[PDB]
Amino acid sequence: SEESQAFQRQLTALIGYDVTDVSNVHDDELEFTRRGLVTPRMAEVASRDPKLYAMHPWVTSKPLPEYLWKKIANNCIFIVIHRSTTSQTIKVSPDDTPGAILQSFFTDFVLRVCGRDEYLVGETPIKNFQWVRHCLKNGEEIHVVLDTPPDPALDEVRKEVSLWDCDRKFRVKIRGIDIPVLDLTVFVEANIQHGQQVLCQRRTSPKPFTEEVLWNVWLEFSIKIKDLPKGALLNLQIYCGKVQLLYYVNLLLIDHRFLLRRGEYVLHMWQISSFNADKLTSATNPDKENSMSISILLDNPIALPKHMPNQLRKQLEAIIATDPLNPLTAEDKELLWHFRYESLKHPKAYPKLFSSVKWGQQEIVAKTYQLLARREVWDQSALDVGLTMQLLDCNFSDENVRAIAVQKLESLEDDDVLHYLLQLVQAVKFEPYHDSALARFLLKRGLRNKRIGHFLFWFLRSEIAQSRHYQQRFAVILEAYLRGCGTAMLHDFTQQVQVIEMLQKVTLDIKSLSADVSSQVISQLKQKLENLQNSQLPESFRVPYDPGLKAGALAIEKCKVMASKKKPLWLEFKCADPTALSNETIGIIFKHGDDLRQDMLILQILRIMESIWETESLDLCLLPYGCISTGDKIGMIEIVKDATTIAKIQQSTVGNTGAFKDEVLNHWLKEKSPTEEKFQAAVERFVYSCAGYCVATFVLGIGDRHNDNIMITETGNLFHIDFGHKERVPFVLTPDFLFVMGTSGKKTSPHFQKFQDICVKAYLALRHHTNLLIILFSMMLMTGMPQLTSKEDIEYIRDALTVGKNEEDAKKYFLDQIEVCRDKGWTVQFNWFL
Ligand SMILES: COc1ccc(Nc2ncc(CN3CCN(S(C)(=O)=O)CC3)cc2-c2nc(C)nc(N)n2)cn1
Numbered sequence: 001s002e003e004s005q006a007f008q009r010q011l012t013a014l015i016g017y018d019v020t021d022v023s024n025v026h027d028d029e030l031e032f033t034r035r036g037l038v039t040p041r042m043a044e045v046a047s048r049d050p051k052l053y054a055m056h057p058w059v060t061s062k063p064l065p066e067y068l069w070k071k072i073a074n075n076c077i078f079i080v081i082h083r084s085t086t087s088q089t090i091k092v093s094p095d096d097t098p099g100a101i102l103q104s105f106f107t108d109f110v111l112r113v114c115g116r117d118e119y120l121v122g123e124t125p126i127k128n129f130q131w132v133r134h135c136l137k138n139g140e141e142i143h144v145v146l147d148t149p150p151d152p153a154l155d156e157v158r159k160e161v162s163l164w165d166c167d168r169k170f171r172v173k174i175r176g177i178d179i180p181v182l183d184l185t186v187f188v189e190a191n192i193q194h195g196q197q198v199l200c201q202r203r204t205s206p207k208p209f210t211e212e213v214l215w216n217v218w219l220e221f222s223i224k225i226k227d228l229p230k231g232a233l234l235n236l237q238i239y240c241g242k243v244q245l246l247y248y249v250n251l252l253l254i255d256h257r258f259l260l261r262r263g264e265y266v267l268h269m270w271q272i273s274s275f276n277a278d279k280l281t282s283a284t285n286p287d288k289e290n291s292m293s294i295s296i297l298l299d300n301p302i303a304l305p306k307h308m309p310n311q312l313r314k315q316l317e318a319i320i321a322t323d324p325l326n327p328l329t330a331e332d333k334e335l336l337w338h339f340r341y342e343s344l345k346h347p348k349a350y351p352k353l354f355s356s357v358k359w360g361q362q363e364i365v366a367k368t369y370q371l372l373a374r375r376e377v378w379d380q381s382a383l384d385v386g387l388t389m390q391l392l393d394c395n396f397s398d399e400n401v402r403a404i405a406v407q408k409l410e411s412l413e414d415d416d417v418l419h420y421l422l423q424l425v426q427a428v429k430f431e432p433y434h435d436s437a438l439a440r441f442l443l444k445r446g447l448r449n450k451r452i453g454h455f456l457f458w459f460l461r462s463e464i465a466q467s468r469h470y471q472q473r474f475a476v477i478l479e480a481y482l483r484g485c486g487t488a489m490l491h492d493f494t495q496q497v498q499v500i501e502m503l504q505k506v507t508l509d510i511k512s513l514s515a516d517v518s519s520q521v522i523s524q525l526k527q528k529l530e531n532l533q534n535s536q537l538p539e540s541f542r543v544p545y546d547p548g549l550k551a552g553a554l555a556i557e558k559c560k561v562m563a564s565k566k567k568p569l570w571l572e573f574k575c576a577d578p579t580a581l582s583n584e585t586i587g588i589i590f591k592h593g594d595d596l597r598q599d600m601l602i603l604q605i606l607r608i609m610e611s612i613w614e615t616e617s618l619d620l621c622l623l624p625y626g627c628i629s630t631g632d633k634i635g636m637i638e639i640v641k642d643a644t645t646i647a648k649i650q651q652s653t654v655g656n657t658g659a660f661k662d663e664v665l666n667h668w669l670k671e672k673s674p675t676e677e678k679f680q681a682a683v684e685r686f687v688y689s690c691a692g693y694c695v696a697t698f699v700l701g702i703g704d705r706h707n708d709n710i711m712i713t714e715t716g717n718l719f720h721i722d723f724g725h726k727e728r729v730p731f732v733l734t735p736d737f738l739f740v741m742g743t744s745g746k747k748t749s750p751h752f753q754k755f756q757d758i759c760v761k762a763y764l765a766l767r768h769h770t771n772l773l774i775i776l777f778s779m780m781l782m783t784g785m786p787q788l789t790s791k792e793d794i795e796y797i798r799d800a801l802t803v804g805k806n807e808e809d810a811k812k813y814f815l816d817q818i819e820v821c822r823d824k825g826w827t828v829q830f831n832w833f834l
Contacts, residue, residue: 007158011482014493016631017464017475024286026265029256030476033434037480038160040440044447045484050152054488055110055119056450058130060415064094066617068136077126079142081105082114082579087143094127101126105146114143115580116548121149130415137619145579154488163226163260163304164362170221170228170253173297174204176214177238180289184209184240188294190219191235192228192253192360195397196275199223199232199360209240225300229359230254231397231432233282236267236294247271247292252282256433260302268293270469274790277429277783278469280394286468307366308339316342320349323803324390324774325794328355340371347381351390354401372400383408385420386772392427392438393779399432406437414449419611421452422604423776425459425474426783434473443477447484454547456481457493462629466595495538500590500630502532503569507592507634511567525569526556540576543586545626545638551586552576558585566593570639587639594724596635599627601784602700602723605776609696609766616765620692620758621685623719640713645721646736647708658833660826662744665712665736672714682716686740687751689718691758694731698817699766699773701796703731707829729828733821746822756815763814770801 012018019034072094079101080089092101098111098120111120113131126132135142174188186209192199200223207213234251247269253261268285269292270278285291308316316339319332328336333356336343343349358364391405409424417424421442428438446453460478464471482490506528513521533554543549551573558572572585606624613620626638646665653664669686673679693710697703702723710732712718718737735745742749766773777797781789802810 010490010494011479014461014482014490014497015464015475015478016461016497017471019475019479023288024268024284024472026267026284027255029282029434030472032256033473033476034480036435037440037443037476040444041447041480041484044444045157048448050155051149052122053448053450054150054152054155055121057119057122057124058415058451059122059124059128060130060133061124061128061413062415062614064127064133065614065619067619068133071136071139077132077136077142079126079144081111082143082145092126095125097123097125099123108149109146110149111144112147112579113548114145115575115577115582117542117550118548119149120144143581155486157484157486160483161301161303163228163254163258163302166225166300166302168225168300170200170223170225170300172219172221172234174215174217174219175295175297176212176216177292177294178212179292180211182209182211186213186238186240186246188215189237189239190221191233191237192221192223193233193235193250194229194231194359195395197359198235206241223360224362225260225302227360227362228253228260229365229398230258230304231399232359233280233432234261236269236296238269238292238294245272248279249284249294250280250282251296252432254304256435258304258306260300260304262298262300262302265296265298266293267296273786275394275782275794276786276789277394277426278467278786280430281469282432282434283469283472307369308342312339313342320346320352322352323798324351324771325778325798326803328352332356340367344371344375345377347378347384347387350378350387350404351395354391354398355395359398368398369400372404375404378404379407383411384772385416386769386775389420389423389427389772389775389779392424392430393775394430394782397430397432399436402431403437406441409438409441414445414452417445417449417452418455419608421455422459422600423779425456425463426779428473428477429470429783434476439477443480446481450485450489451547453481453485453489454492454542454544457485458544458628458630462597462600462631462635465632466597466629492542495541496544498536498538499541500544500634500636502537503571503590504592504631504634506532507567507569507590510561510569511592514561514567517561517563517567522560525559525561529554529556529559543588543626544628544630544636549586550576551588555585562589566591568592568637572639584641587641589637589639590634591637592634594635595633596627596629596637596724597784599635599637599723600629601780602702603627605700605773605780606696608772608776609692612769612772613762613765616761616768618758618761618765619688620695620762621688621717622692622696623689623713623717625719625721640711640719642714643711643717643719644714645708646710646712646734647706649712650707658830660736660829662735662739666740669712669716669740678715682714683740683751685716686712686718686737687755688758689716690733690737691755691762693718693720694733694818695759695762695766698731699763699797699800700777701800704729704828705732706832707732707734726831727827729824730817730820732828733818734829735825738822756818759818760811760814764807764811767801767807767810770803773797773801 075093077092078089079092080087090104118131120129132142172190185206187206188204190202200221202219202221204215204217232253234253236249237245238247239245249267249269255261268288270285316335336353336356343353357368388405388408392402396402424442431438446456460474463474510525540550540552543551553574555572555574560570562568562570568589568591571588571590575586603624606622610622623640625640629635649664649668650660654661669682670679673682709722710720741751741755743752774797778794781794802813
């Protein structure tokens with residue numbers, strides 16, 4: 001109907017890509033994927049409890065850490081409950097279920113966290129609600145309101161010849177290449193591929209490079225048609241010449257219906273700007289009028305069916321015992337495959353084991369599926385995310401192998417999904433087909449949970465906007481999601497897209513008026529911001545990086561354009577919630593010109609490090625602020641309240657010179673403390689903050705930073721910013737940081753001795769997750785950071801995390817690192833000036 005068509009116009013606007021479109025396809029896969037996702041969509045929409053879905057109790061089921069236990073008033077917490085305005089505080093024990101606390105009060109209505117769309121409902125103890133764990137973390141009082149539970153009717157949705165019996169060698173005709181606009185010899189290269197593994201390869205003869213080049217030649221491969229494994233790609237590449245890769249493109253050999261690929265294809269190609277997610281894509285270049293294209297012929301009803309010695313033991317164990325960046329040699333691979341069944345008893349052998357399979361060999365693949373048919377130990381094992389992630393990366397392309405990882409993901413609690421969601425979304429870039437267990441998993445987990453679903457939207461939306469390589473796929477996943485989240489959430493997303501689009505318009509305009517930063521330009525900002533205040537910016541919108549917060553009208557006076565050379569918008573909003581117990585504005589930086597996905601990744605890895613540290617009862621008070629990529633080169637950043645940079649603290653005392661002074665920071669910290677209890681706690685928070693950032697930035701290899709890119713709160717919380725962008729330094733430990741701790745150049749201190757004692761505990765704790773961090777780091781680089789995609793860059797983290805080396809020796813490596821920051825002093829900061 002037409003009702004279905006205005007709604008399609010709406011979905012398209014929410015995604016920021018026209019799904020129904022067919023200008024950039026060469027088959028029906030994306031359309032097949034839309035239909036195939038209807039079932040998982042509906043099966044989740046129908047089965048989800050409408051009551052718990054409307055209130056999304058953000059609950060964890062982890063042990064409440066040792067650091068938050070011994071910060072309690074004897075198994076009792078104070079919850080302040082609010083009627084109209086006035087309130088009654090109630091004593092409550094960590095085990096008191098929410099519905100039972102209502103009985104404790106009444107001596108149906110629901111509890112909603114004052115100021116937020118966050119509910120304390122369902123059958124979990126209150127110590128298992130993240131909001132509560134946050135209040136304790138930041139030593140604060142749990143304020144809640146007696147509210148009427150939201151109507152689940154708002155969540156309602158608008159109801160809508162066998163291949164193995166073929167011994168032919170694989171051939172492909174290269175008709176030629178056409179380039180609209182342009183002397184050096186050119187050739188086409190053709191690969192049969194599975195993952196990264198090039199199974200078989202063929203070049204053509206080099207011809208003179210002109211607007212059109214024709215070959216009309218058959219390329220016979222040595223691989224047989226029956227040996228082609230599902231997921232196999234034809235990778236066509238074009239070099240010229242000591243040569244250079246110019247354009248590349250890919251084609252699935254076995255399509256989504258299990259059929260061998262036949263007929264004519266006129267594929268549009270991508271240009272090189274090297275492990276890249278993009279280099280694996282089944283998508284062809286949309287830019288018809290500017291791009292190179294290859295023309296090919298396939299002629300081969302062909303569908304695929306659906307079917308020890310002590311030293312060796314030691315050699316095998318040592319192979320299982322290595323990191324995921326250690327290259328397996330031929331001896332290793334031949335050993336793993338032979339001792340296949342021993343290797344299946346060890347969950348950690350799996351990544352290595354399935355990297356030992358020869359996929360260009362039908363009967364070996366068959367044997368591998370028999371091996372998966374008998375995977376009892378894997379199916380029973382206690383889930384490791386690091387092992388699971390390893391099997392969803394680029395090294396694996398077999399749908400069944402990848403499906404054993406997704407299987408393990410099914411058992412993740414919703415809280416743990418949010419922790420890994422970003423990388424899981426990125427992991428979709430390694431799936432051969434648009435419809436996969438993983439896609440379905442994300443699809444349903446987002447549909448089951450309003451929070452996961454919120455972030456899924458922005459994660460996918462972000463990729464759709466700044467990746468031609470995967471927009472089509474993600475777009476199909478997002479449409480499938482939005483068709484299930486419900487009119488309630490669809491309307492939230494709408495307002496949010498409305499706001500960021502309006503803001504971008506203002507940003508683009510203001511950027512043009514500048515060159516440094518004027519003050520009359522700020523008047524033109526405040527001008528156009530008022531122009532939007534009535535028509536037609538919606539009263540209130542959810543904050544993309546913090547979906548609990550509803551932001552209302554702008555604080556126009558407080559809005560400015562930043563001193564940066566990409567002119568970000570410093571913005572502040574009223575909180576739209578009348579029940580909000582404060583008057584603090586919501587501070588958002590709105591930035592155009594940088595692709596923020598990179599900052600997203602680092603900050604997410606930072607949250608992972610936190611949760612890792614929670615398992616070891618540590619807490620290092622990092623500030624991984626909100627950061628959402630919302631469009632093509634636009635996003636928003638959470639402004640951390642009461643925070644100034646290190647550089648500005650120097651730029652104010654010493655002056656705009658550069659002759660830095662040690663004392664300045666401690667004095668700065670003292671001028672901001674009401675008591676000595678509030679100064680030492682502030683110094684204490686600096687002891688962790690700094691130690692947290694020191695460790696983390698060193699492992700990630702982003703430690704060496706300009707001191708204007710490090711900020712501090714007035715409560716002692718140090719934190720790095722702007723992960724967007726000669727002799728070296730590991731991290732940033734300056735004589736002013738060391739002053740706060742006590743040291744004066746070459747001494748020790750009551751706190752400094754604790755600094756190293758917290759750093760090492762932190763460094764070694766991350767080291768217990770070497771595998772996970774390695775795979776996170778690599779996926780970060782492969783899917784999010786194309787500027788640094790060499791093997792040299794990934795092998796940094798092997799050195800940084802000191803693989804193989806035992807604990808005590810690695811401790812000494814880290815202690816040496818701190819003792820390089822002592823040696824270097826200020827020669828780091830100083831050198832940036834010119
Ligand atoms: C990835 O892009 C960005 C951009 C900005 C930030 N954050 C900040 N960047 C710079 C500053 C320093 N700033 C200089 C300009 N002046 S001015 C006169 O133009 O208003 C304000 C202070 C601060 C931040 C920043 N970042 C966060 C996350 N919080 C806070 N409080 N501050 C992080 N990432």
